[PDB]
Structure formats: C-alpha cells, structure tokens
Amino acid sequence: KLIAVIVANIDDYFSTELFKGISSILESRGYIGVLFDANADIEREKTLLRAIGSRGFDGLILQSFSNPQTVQEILHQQMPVVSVDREMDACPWPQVVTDNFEAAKAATTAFRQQGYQHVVVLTSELELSRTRQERYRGILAAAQDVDVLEVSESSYNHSEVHQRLTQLITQNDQKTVAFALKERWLLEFFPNLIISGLIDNQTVTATGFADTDFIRRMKLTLITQNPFLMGASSAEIMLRQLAGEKVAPEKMVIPAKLQ
Amino acid sequence: QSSKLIAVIVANIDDYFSTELFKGISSILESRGYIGVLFDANADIEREKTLLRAIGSRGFDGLILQSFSNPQTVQEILHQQMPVVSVDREMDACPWPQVVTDNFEAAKAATTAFRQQGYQHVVVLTSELELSRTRQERYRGILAAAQDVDVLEVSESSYNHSEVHQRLTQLITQNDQKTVAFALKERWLLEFFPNLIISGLIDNQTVTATGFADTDFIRRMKLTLITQNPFLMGASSAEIMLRQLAGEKVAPEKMVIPAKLQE
C-alpha cells in the first residue's frame, strides 16, 4: 500500500510540506507515502516514472513538469494519478491547484490601494511553467506599472541578479513593491534588501508566494498556498481512487491567503 | 533481478540537511540502476517503526538510516534481511557501517577560531542535549574551547517563539564580553538569528553568530558558518551501500566527513 509522490525539487519547502500533507491523510488508512525527487530533470522523472510503474506502487501523486501524455506512455493507466500545482491541459486525472491568477491579482490590487503603483516581478523563467504565467497575468491585470526580472534557475549569478534588481526598484522613485513569484527568490534576495534599508515600507515594500514561517518574522505581507492542505486534499482524492470510486478528472482550487 | 529500491529514512524532511542528503544518495545510486526512495520519520520514533515494517514487507534492497531507530529496533523488525548504513548519528558500538561528521572537532575548532577574534562568551542555542549524542558532542567541543559558555535548550516538542527569543537576547546581553551566538542546529539559526541581525544586536564587533547550517540564503545576510556537506555525506553513504549490495562484507566502522567552517 505505497503511494509514490514525485515532486519537482525536494529542496523546496512547498514540496516537503505538500508531502507531509499527503502522508498525514494516507496514514488514516494504513497507506504510506513515498517521496521521489525529480531533481528538476525531465529525464530523471521519466526513469522514476518507469520504476514507479514496474515496481507495483499503488498510486501516484504528481507535482511536476511532464505532459500528461509523457505520463500515460509510461504508466498506461495501471494506477490512480493526481497532479498538483501544475494546471495542465487535457488532463485525464484529478488536479489540485491554487487560484494563482486571482490571488496575485488581489495582492497587486491591495498594494496598489496603498500607493505602491510600481511592481517589480521577480520570477523564474515564465514559459517553463503555467502557474508562473498565471501569477504574472494576475499582476498585469491590476498593476499600474510593471517591470519584470526573469531568472533561469539553471544558470544565474547571485550578485548579477541582485544588481539588476536594485536597479528596477530604484530607477524611478515611484513607490515600488518587489513581488517574488516563487519562494526561493524571496528568501535569496529580500533579506539583504531589508538590512540595507531599500525595503523600508515607505517607498519600497515586498511580497510574494511564500509559506515558510520564518521569513515573516524578519513584518511583510505574503501570499500562502498552504502546500500542506494541497497535499492533504490530493491524498483524499487518491483515497477515493484506491477505494475504487471512479473519480472525475476535474480541477480542485484551494484558494490562497494574503496574510 | 530484484526491486533495486533503496529506502532512505530521514529524521524530518523539513531539514535541508535531509533533502540534500537524499540528493547525494540518489546521484550515486543512479550510476548502478538503484533508486533512492525517501521516507519521512517526521520526528516520530513510532512513525519510523511503521515505516521500517513497511520497508521490510515490500522488498527494498537496502536501508540508509538518518533517523532515531537503534539497532535493537532495526533487528527486531527487518532481521538483517537487507544491508544497512547509518548517517549523521554518532552511535557508539554500531553494528553497521556509518557516515558521520567530526562533531566534537568541528565545534571545538569553530569556537577556537571565534575566540582568536575576541569572542570569549559563547551562547549555545540547541535542541535538548540529552536527546542526542551529536548535539552533546558539538556542545562538548565548544566547552573544550571556551571559558564563558551559557546554554539555551529548546524543546522541539513544545517551545514558544518569543519565549526562546527573549531568553537568547538575555543571555547574549548579560555582560560585556564579545559574544558568539552558536546554534547547534540549522532550524534555530534560521528561526532566531535574522531578527537579531535586523534589530542590530548581531553587529560583528561585540556580538557575532555562527552554527551548523548548510542552506545558502542565510549565507547572504556575512556570517561565518559550519557546513556538514550533506550531499557528500549522502553520496558517501550511498557508495558504502553499493559496496554492500555488491556483496562486500563492509566492516562496521565510521567514515568521517569533516565539516567545514566557511566564511
């Protein structure tokens, strides 16, 4: 009674917390969650997918980058599947996602209503993920002026990004809000900016999609996805699939919270 | 032909040390067709037992242990059906091979480096000492190098944030001796040091801070920290496992991966 859980990168708090959610729910039925690291590698995921399939795992909860076809061509309906945080197309199985566009929108609208009309979006490459595009789409629909700084998680230099970032925030003394689209960018760059004083909550402030209890205590307003809940919810769906209940391949939206 | 699945049980996946450990194990095991599988003990020794019972009744070909189970537990449940390698435990008289850090030497050297810069007063922040031999060793290393040493034990089970905060601030500020706040575990450094850097307490002139931590983002705050090289510890433990899987009667000795004090 093992459920394989493949995450994009076990180094993200979102992923380890999501897994803790699956586990918590799976334990109420004697089922056990098992974690696999796709290590941001399309190929590692493929070889992992084959192993998961041939070894007889009972279920697959997937928060990754491969098209549903890539997953069907390897597992071929031999087990229940639930994808998380990806919002893909023509998905033949259930999905649990955040209201990315909406949450980003509301966030941007709140900051706008406080004079911070300038927004600098710090994100990973947009075209590689649909949830990233949605968040950026949400910021675009409610922001007056927007500047974007895309970073390739596979090739970049800390100071190089740090400089282009300080730049975008201070080019105009327009009241700016630095908006991180993923937690790692918020943890890597904003702390220093708080110490240097650029982020004074007067002219410049900061926000982003972060779920870690320890950034908040340095107080900024962050958007949380509550990955634990998303993980718990996907596992409920998975219980239904193992129990035999034919499940509808629909999207379940766990709303984000601007706290 | 077998499962070729190696079970890896970590103390808690929330620890960056664990996830990196696993990454190390996975890159080595891959070179030979083996696949690391991650299990989360979630800080519960009971949880761990059911994971082990599952690991033995599903046919995994090996176990890499970075958790709480003693050998009596692992014997009674798995009965040596599969080779075992332990990591980051500092267990004496261990029956299987081990991969550990020079906890005493590393702490001692770090304290010595700080003393030479003037910091004579060490404020140790840690999870309960009795609960772990590795913590005890790092604490043992500090006392072996510093005069004025105060200790602040935190209960991972039930502790209050501002409660611990207020005490740390009390111990750091009691006298004029230059002080080093030394975290024995990464989480404590990550939870309590940032505000002390932002509030001005930690200024690198009268009060500085260090600890065992491998995460990069704190690096960028410039603090001097001790890294355990978890990826390397994980890869080394996987190298030993492959030797056992290849049928080598690997002696149950400890392989020491020295920690590095990195500015």
**CATH placement of domain A98-225+255-259:** 3.40.50.2300
CA dist., res. B52 & res. B71, Å (int): 12
CA dist., res. A101 & res. A71, Å (int): 26
Q: Quick one: closest CA in A to B165, which residue?
A: A217
Full DSSP string of B170-207: HHHTSSSS-EEEEESSHHHHHHHSHHHHHSSS--SSSE
Distances in Å between the alpha carbon of A155 and those of A150, A151, B6, B241? 11, 8, 31, 33
CA dist., res. B261 & res. A149, Å (int): 34
CA dist., res. A112 & res. A115, Å (int): 5
Instruction: Tell me how crowded residue B203 is: count the other CB atoms within 10 A of its CB.
Output: 10
Whether A11 and B5 lie within 8 Å, measured CB to CB: no
A-B C-beta contacts closer than 8 Å: 77
Structural resolution in Å = 2.0
Q: Quick one: closest CA in B to A197, which residue?
A: B198
Task: Tell me which residue in A20, A39, A195 faces B40 most closely, judged by beta carbons.
Answer: A20
Q: What superfamily would CATH give domain A1-97+226-254? A: Response regulator (3.40.50.2300)
Whether A188 and B220 lie within 8 Å, measured CB to CB: yes
Find which of B26, B28, B31, B38 to mutate to test the A interface (most A CBs within 10 Å of its CB). Answer: B38
**Beta-strand relationship, A59-63 and A2-7:** parallel
* Distant-in-sequence contacts of B171-176, Cβ < 8 A, 24+ apart: B171/B123, B172/B123, B172/B196, B172/B201, B172/B207, B173/B201, B174/B150, B175/B121, B175/B148, B176/B206
Q: Coil, strand or helix: which one is B55?
A: helix
* HSE, side-chain direction, 13 A CA sphere, residue B253: 5
**B58 close to A (CB below 8 A):** yes
Contacts of B58 in chain A (CB under 8 A): 2
Which residue's structure tokens are 């926000």?
A207
Which residues lie below 8 Å from residue B36, measured CB to CB, with a gap of 6+? B6, B8, B22, B25, B26, B29, B64, B238
Whether B19 and A13 lie within 8 Å, measured CB to CB: no
Which residues lie below 8 Å from residue B161, measured CB to CB, with a gap of 6+? A217, B191
Domains B1-100+229-257 and B101-228+258-263 share a fold: yes
**B37 close to A (CB below 8 A):** yes
- Method used to solve the structure: X-ray
Whether B221 and A11 lie within 8 Å, measured CB to CB: no
CA dist., res. A223 & res. A235, Å (int): 23
Task: Tell me which residue in A33, A51, A214 faces B191 most closely, judged by beta carbons.
Answer: A214
Element (H, E) at B244: helix B230-245
* Environment class of A24 (CB within 10 Å of its CB; exposed 0-12, middle 13-18, buried 19+): middle
Report residue B199 as tokens. Answer: 């509030």
Architecture of the structural domain at B101-228+258-263:
3-Layer(aba) Sandwich (3.40)
Q: What superfamily would CATH give domain B1-100+229-257? A: Response regulator (3.40.50.2300)
CA dist., res. B36 & res. B30, Å (int): 8
**B14 close to A (CB below 8 A):** yes
Full DSSP string of B23-41: HHHHHHHHTTT-EEEEEE-
Task: Tell me which residue in B14, B37, B221 faces A34 most closely, judged by beta carbons.
Answer: B37
Contacts of B3 in chain A (CB under 8 A): 55
Say how far residue B60 (Cα) sits from the centre of its chain: 25
Instruction: Tell me how crowded residue A49 is: count the other CB atoms within 10 A of its CB.
Output: 23
Name the minimum distance, in Å, from the CA of B55 to any CA of chain A: 10
Mutual orientation of helices A42-54 and A68-75 as an angle, nearest 10°?
Answer: 30
Whether A191 and B195 lie within 8 Å, measured CB to CB: no
Q: Coil, strand or helix: which one is B82?
A: coil
The one-letter amino acid code at A190 reads F
Whether A10 and B22 lie within 8 Å, measured CB to CB: yes
Distances in Å between the alpha carbon of A137 and those of A105, A134, A143? 8, 5, 10
Question: For chain A, which residues make up each domain, given as ranges?
Answer: 1-97+226-254, 98-225+255-259
HEC readout, B104-164: HHHHHHHHHHHHCCCCCEEEEEEECCCCCHHHHHHHHHHHCCCCEEEEEEECCCCCCHHHH
Contacts of A11 in chain B (CB under 8 A): 16, 19-20, 23
The one-letter amino acid code at B196 reads L
Which residue's structure tokens are 């899987």?
B245
Q: A153 — phi, psi (to 5°)?
A: -60, -15
CA dist., res. A111 & res. A121, Å (int): 13
CA dist., res. B145 & res. B111, Å (int): 6
- Strands annotated E in chain A: 2-7, 32-37, 59-63, 81-84, 95-98, 118-124, 145-151, 176-180, 204-208, 223-224, 251-254, 257-258
Q: A187 — phi, psi (to 5°)?
A: -70, -35
Q: Measure the N-to-C terminal CA separation of chain A; round to a whole number of Å.
A: 38
**A40 close to B (CB below 8 A):** no
Residue A167: name the closest of A228, A129, A122, A102 by CA: A122
* Environment class of B252 (CB within 10 Å of its CB; exposed 0-12, middle 13-18, buried 19+): middle
Q: Coil, strand or helix: which one is B21?
A: helix
Report residue B12 as tokens. Answer: 């808690």
